[PDB]
Design an enzyme around this catalytic site. Structure first.
Site: not given
Ligand code: CLF
Ligand code: ICS
Ligand SMILES: [Fe+3]
Ligand SMILES: [Fe+3]
Lengths: 522, 477, 522
Positions: C156, C152
């Site tokens: 973004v 994500c």
């Molecule tokens: S590095 Fe850490 S765990 Fe990764 S996203 Fe970023 S804060 Fe989270 Fe949660 S939502 Fe899914 S797993 Fe990622 S792709 Fe977007």
């Protein structure tokens, strides 16, 4: 009183208040029941160790046995031949009970007939019964072969089968070329597996005794497979699949897997599949004969060694890792075919599952009962998993089998706790699981009461049952499970580890009491 | 053993990598010399991971939410952002707690904003306020709210601090924002730092002016014990047998009340230096409470730590301490007498992110087991300063090891056991090497204290010796 | 205090007297915990209809969701190709969580790679990260293909995957002929099944969209099967098995079962099996393409109908009896191959099991949550068995799917008391099972807490959970099960009937209280 929207069966309809009052009134007024405190005292007494010494002492009374009689196994063996009708010479109650037993286990039609011997035959013998029954069955149900067994009534009478069948053929009741193999299966000797052995030897001797002159060992380049008393269709299927994946010519002798699993398509098939008479006739031409369950195939072993001149290998039941490896090695040596990569990958997958489930399995205590070969294979697999079989029970085991099982338990540090019981019934096992509590039981449906008994003492003394064996009545379609081979080993592993995990989940489910260990990941 | 052979092993692993990757990974591999006392001279750490090397470390969100804030029972923690991030961490780390989930305890849940496209392009402060109101109406017994940011929260222009302040002024509720976006930092360590800063900035100072709590000269606060499988309770039973009074534990089975009452204790016993050293330093600077490190892994370290704690109190504490050591001597002595002969002389290689590889060594050596190699995924230099003196001579030390490097290391060293995270658990089981899940005690435990040492020895024995590790090879090849 | 001969783990060591007293002291002194009566009253309030109305008025808060983010499905899809490395552009915590999740479900090694993006990248992009990561991954793990998925955070900041990959290729970081398919997988859209769809569409476009010059539909005499997001290896096995005995030519696209089931023989294999790049290139030369899960293979269907010029049939998921029949008949029509007798006998055996197990199954109430295609197939099978699916929940479903499920429910008289919910989570289902109690729940491991909650209200209110779905964490080796086809229907039927029978056995195990219904034969 019933509500039409929510209709209640006996449970929990009889938990209603009016029914409770009715039952209380009946018990108080007319039953003369012992005081509840006296009943609790007697139950607690039955739990203790002095009771176990009295229970072990008995030399005559049998309470809740773990075995059946020979004609049941004889009928199961006869069902494995093509277009063959099992025929039990004796009283009809035997056949009714056999059919009900197998119907409840397999949930499939079971075809068997009797000559309905009565007081007339009790006084004057049952030869006329034999003649009339043979003619009637051949005319009505049109089998290609009739396999004759005996009940305890026939054996006490001393009615002999050979003369009766010969007189039936000589007097025109059945054609002289119609195959009528027979065996004597006394219910006061051995158990159902002995009856299976007797029936198989009778059929094999019927088809392969008067023509040994033109038989050359190894001429058809096939291996004979004798499964024995087997109530898991997956075992037949897995043996066939393992031998077919290996490019090995084989003849499965007495396989009932087709008639015991027929499709529901709008018609009823009394006969389906089975070992052909040609395969039985050509059996001595095979390279060798292997017995999947040697400990209840002994007379068959003697016949095959002394008449077919086959060097029957000394193999254990192909259960677990090591014995499946040995079975595949012996098949490879006999047939000259190498073990393919698919079997190697399957064995590696089994080892992977063992290493994945090892942490839960390590050090679990198991009490198990069943037929000799099945029990010994299960004990071997339990030893290979790091589990502790603490109570080993075989109602139809002998002293040689006990010696072999003790030798098996001696070669592993997980059999120090283990003790072997022969001739003991399930009341003995109830005493054993009360005084020396294991973690689980492994056996047939008859153990469900023992669990019940344990639950009466308290939840911390409850011993859950795991349903592997014969007969299983309170569960559906478990007869399609596989116990033999790598596939059977992994099915058993899944059952064991998931039973342990389910027990742990049940124990750790109390909110704010034990649910700190109610882990999502296990 | 044979430093030159170990140096040759390291160089051979380095050769496959490209020039930049090899140059970076050279400095993260070392051979332990106990005489050396400055880690920066030989080994480097806390640097950005090299891309595309199958690393093992997590994000700052993990280190804040799933480590520090997560185990606090009566708070409600909101994973602000898309759904998956909070879903993958739900009940994935087991911290034991005593409570009723859904009413007053909410540890094993996943509260999330469940961001969509409209939230990404239009922001999510309004949704945050609505979510706070929904939490208030549906969970009325929660004593506080935490808002843990995910990557798009920081990447889009969202302001959660103002929302937190407004909502906490309106509902008179403690609502803390945590800027624990995953892209911040290089591993879970910056998550620890951010979470500790949040605790300092929003929770610690609530009861500064309040002095209605009776104080005892035997008041200690446990910091850095997260009750993994019941570890904190096992330490606390020993501490209360020493006659001390534990007012708080951070943060396993912890509550906002104990966090607020922590500044009133006399001593701070810090179990995890790496995650919670910042808060202890701040406490010492502000409130003047001394803090000291203790180690309950193994009977030797447990006894030494207990004597160290007793050396900071009166004579009665020392007497009662000596009594606890005498009372528990026979139990651990019997455990050793049972399990040492079956584990003596076996060699282990452990890769755990911080604190545990140096800590676990005392329990292993007590069972007569040698650690022939150790590494930390996210530990700083000071952890290595402790490790060098805690480690045997001519052993291998790795920082942010990759899958290939660890694989080749174990293939050349051939240890008898590996202790590591689940990401490596099935990799090393397929090679026939027994494996132990250090992060989750393999769903067993606890391991701390005299009560946990028996479980540790039993688990080690059963994994090291099993009738499966001898059956990897088919006997026809 | 621990005995050396009987060591206790967290359960039940923490039930000891001293631990209980210590916990009570902690709670009483320093926790400032709400009084127990308040806790009980709040718990009781949470199980009422007013709480259900308040909880169903939720608009912004999500509690206990039943879905995962997009790139997880993309990683699973990438794992289905030969020597293909799943590569995720973004931060490394996402990849760590993906690997942990799949390791916990499959209990197998799962390999994924990340460019370790950081706040310094957030302001300058991840082009250098992509270049270095591609070079390092290619040089280190030697794959034949790298498949790219986006976090994500990468989505973004608007990273252009095509431009970054092209610049990496042009500047010599990777060979220009190295296949590097890419897909945009924003985690704030859809769910993981959408990620599987996006990655499969990206790979198919990478290999086939450019080369439309030499492709003739129906040239290789093969059918393309796209399985979608599947976490049961048995589903791949059963699909491959049914086509092979049929003899139809087939080409499975994106199958990870060999990688997700690797033997433990002493060596670790990072790659195993998969679908070759030749298969992907030869894909448009097939007669047709079949999608096993149409309701999340939408963009794939669009691409297949637009570029491949294939007439994708309107086939449901082959779950149950009727839909398996339709799938088999459609494959027979397309490939020109008749349906063999073995398939007919397997169907007949399924019907036989249905007739044998119908009385227990009839009228039972089930609440089920899961992926859309799986949920709808489960609903179809439940209606086929005479069961009543009361609460149907699908977090990642849509309005069209809800209309289809409503039509399926209306087509049968057993769907009268049925409601379909989309966009709802497991707290909504908790309220639903507290206010409208079903007999059982069907779903993944996250339901184990709901059961716990029900058991806290009372034993008569407890709703047992049946573990069918993804992910399963608290049970071992259930990922080897099958759900598709006649075999999967048999397994599901056995699970359902035996779950009912174990629940009944538990309810009637009370000595002299409810054990009048503790029947041996069921
Ligand atoms: S590095 Fe850490 S765990 Fe990764 S996203 Fe970023 S804060 Fe989270 Fe949660 S939502 Fe899914 S797993 Fe990622 S792709 Fe977007
Ligand atoms: S907090 Fe840290 S990774 Fe010190 S983030 Fe991690 S429950 Fe590890 S080596 Mo999981 S610095 Fe604790 C840890 Fe150690 S989650 Fe646990 S085991 S002792
Ligand atoms: Fe049947
Ligand atoms: Fe595995």
């Amino acid at each position: 009183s019933q509500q039409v929207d929510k209709i209640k069966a006996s449970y929990p309809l009889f938990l209603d208040q009016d029914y409770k009052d009715m039952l209380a009134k009946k018990r108080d007024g007319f039953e003369e029941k012992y005081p509840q405190d006296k009943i609790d005292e007697v139950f607690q007494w039955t739990t203790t160790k002095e009771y176990q010494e009295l229970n072990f002492q008995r030399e005559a009374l049998t309470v809740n046995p773990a075995k059946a009689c020979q004609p049941l196994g004889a009928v199961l063996c006869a069902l494995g031949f093509e277009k063959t009708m099992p025929y039990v010479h004796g009283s009809q109650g035997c056949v009714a009970y056999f059919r009900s037993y197998f119907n409840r286990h397999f949930r499939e039609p079971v075809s068997c007939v009797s000559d309905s011997m009565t007081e007339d035959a009790a006084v004057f013998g049952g030869q006329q019964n034999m003649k009339d029954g043979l003619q009637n069955c051949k005319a009505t149900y049109k089998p290609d072969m009739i396999a004759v067994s005996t009940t305890c009534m026939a054996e006490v009478i001393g009615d002999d089968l050979n003369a009766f069948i010969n007189n039936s053929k000589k007097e025109g009741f059945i054609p002289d070329e119609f195959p009528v193999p027979f065996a004597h299966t006394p219910s006061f000797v051995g158990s159902h597996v002995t009856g299976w052995d007797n029936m198989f030897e009778g059929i094999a001797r019927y088809f392969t005794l008067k023509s040994m002159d033109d038989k050359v060992v190894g001429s058809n380049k096939k291996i004979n497979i004798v499964p024995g008393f087997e109530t898991y269709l997956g075992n037949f299927r897995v043996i066939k699949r393992m031998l077919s994946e290996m490019g090995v010519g084989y003849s499965l002798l007495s396989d009932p897997e087709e008639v015991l699993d027929t499709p529901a398509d709008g018609q009823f098939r009394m006969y389906a599949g089975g070992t052909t008479q040609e395969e039985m006739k050509d059996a001595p031409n095979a390279l060798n004969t292997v017995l999947l369950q040697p400990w209840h195939l002994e007379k068959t072993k003697k016949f095959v060694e002394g008449t077919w001149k086959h060097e029957v290998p000394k193999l254990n039941i192909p259960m677990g890792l090591d014995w499946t490896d040995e079975f595949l090695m012996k098949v490879s040596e006999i047939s000259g075919q190498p073990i393919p990569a698919s079997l190697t990958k399957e064995r590696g997958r089994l080892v992977d599952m063992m290493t994945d489930s090892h942490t839960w399995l390590h050090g679990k205590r198991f009490a198990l009962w069943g037929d000799p070969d099945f029990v010994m294979g299960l004990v071997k697999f339990l030893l290979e998993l790091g589990c502790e079989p603490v109570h080993i029970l075989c109602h139809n085991g002998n002293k040689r089998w006990k010696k072999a099982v003790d030798a098996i338990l001696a070669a592993s540090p997980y059999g120090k706790n283990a003790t072997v019981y022969i001739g003991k019934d399930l009341w003995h096992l109830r005493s054993l699981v009360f005084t020396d509590k294991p973690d689980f039981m492994i056996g047939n449906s008859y153990g469900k009461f023992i669990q019940r008994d344990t639950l009466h003492k308290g939840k911390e003394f409850e011993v859950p049952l795991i349903r592997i064996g014969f007969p299983i009545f309170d569960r559906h379609h478990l007869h399609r499970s596989t116990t033999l081979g790598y596939e059977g080993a992994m099915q058993i592993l899944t059952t064991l580890v998931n039973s342990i995990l389910e027990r742990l989940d049940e124990e750790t489910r109390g909110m704010q009491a034990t649910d700190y260990n109610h882990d999502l990941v296990r | 053993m044979s430093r030159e052979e170990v140096e040759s092993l390291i160089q051979e692993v380095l050769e496959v990598y490209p020039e930049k990757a090899r140059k970076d990974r050279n400095k993260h591999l070392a051979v332990n010399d106990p005489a050396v006392t400055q880690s920066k001279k030989c080994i480097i750490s806390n640097k950005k991971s090299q891309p595309g090397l199958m690393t093992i470390r997590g994000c700052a969100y993990a280190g804040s939410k799933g480590v520090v804030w997560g185990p606090i029972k009566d708070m409600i923690h909101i994973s602000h952002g898309p759904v998956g991030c909070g879903q993958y961490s739900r009940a994935g780390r087991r911290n034991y707690y005593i409570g009723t989930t859904g009413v007053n305890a909410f540890v094993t849940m996943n509260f999330t904003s469940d961001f969509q496209e409209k939230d990404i392009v239009f922001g999510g402060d309004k949704k945050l306020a609505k979510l706070i109101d929904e939490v208030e109406t549906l969970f009325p017994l929660n004593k506080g709210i935490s808002v843990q940011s995910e990557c798009p929260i920081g990447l889009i222009g969202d302001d959660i601090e103002s929302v937190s302040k407004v909502k906490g002024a309106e509902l008179s509720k403690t609502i803390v924002p945590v800027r624990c976006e995953g892209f911040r930092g290089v591993s879970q360590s910056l998550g620890h730092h951010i979470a500790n800063d949040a605790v300092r900035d929003w929770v610690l100072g609530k009861r500064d002016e309040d002095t209605t709590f009776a104080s005892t000269p035997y008041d200690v606060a446990i910091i850095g014990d997260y009750n993994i499988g019941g570890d904190a309770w096992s330490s606390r039973i020993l501490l209360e047998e020493m006659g001390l009074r534990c007012v708080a534990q951070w943060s396993g089975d912890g509550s906002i009340s104990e966090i607020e009452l922590t500044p009133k204790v006399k001593l701070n016993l810090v179990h995890c230096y790496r995650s919670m050293n910042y808060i202890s330093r701040h406490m010492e600077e502000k409130y003047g409470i001394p803090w000291m490190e203790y180690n309950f892994f193994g009977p030797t370290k447990t006894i030494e730590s207990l004597r160290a704690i007793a050396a900071k109190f009166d004579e009665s504490i020392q007497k009662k301490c000596e009594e606890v050591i005498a009372k528990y001597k026979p139990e651990w002595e019997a455990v050793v007498a049972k399990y040492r002969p079956r584990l003596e002389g076996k060699r282990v290689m452990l890769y755990i992110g911080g604190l545990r590889p140096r800590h676990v060594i005392g329990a292993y050596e007590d069972l007569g087991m040698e650690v022939v190699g150790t590494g930390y995924e996210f530990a700083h230099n000071d952890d290595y300063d402790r490790t060098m003196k805690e480690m045997g001579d001519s052993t291998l030390l790795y920082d942010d090891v990759t899958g290939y490097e660890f694989e080749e290391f174990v293939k050349r060293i051939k240890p008898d056991l590996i202790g590591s995270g689940i990401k490596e658990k099935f990799i090393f089981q397929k090679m026939g090497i027994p494996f132990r899940e250090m992060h989750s005690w393999d769903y067993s435990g606890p391991y701390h204290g005299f009560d946990g040492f028996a479980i540790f020895a039993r688990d080690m024995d059963m994994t090291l010796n099993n009738p499966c590790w001898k059956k990897l090879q088919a006997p026809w090849e």
